[PDB]
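Hey team,

Sharing the 30S ribosomal protein S8e run so nobody has to redo it. Sequence (133 residues) first:
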Amino acid sequence: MGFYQGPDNRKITGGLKGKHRDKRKYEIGNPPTFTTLSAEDIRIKDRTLGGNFKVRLKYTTTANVLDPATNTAKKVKILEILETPANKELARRGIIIRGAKIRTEAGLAVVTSRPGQDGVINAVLLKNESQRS
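Structure output:
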């Protein structure tokens, strides 16, 4: 009870600290080179490509002329039927009936059998031109 000094407060300013200036560290510079290709490699599989398959021989329409003079049966190509059978329109296709005249690379022959599995109709040479009258 008389006199007493009150709470004296001062400003303790001790923030005397500077920062630093920043430079480059170790940043990624140049990128690496690239790969080439495999185009020519695929072109080497492309160059060695195979050829093409060939053709086959087929069954030509034949008449099996037994030649009575030589007594030997032969396969000669069919020209045409001359003496018209009842089944002429079928004999055009080559379905000829026994007794109808036909021309072969041999001569005039008469069909003496039915059409074979080859489409080969057996015939016999009459050893002359049979007069159609």
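The two ends are 177 Å apart (CA to CA).

Ping me if you want the raw files.
A.
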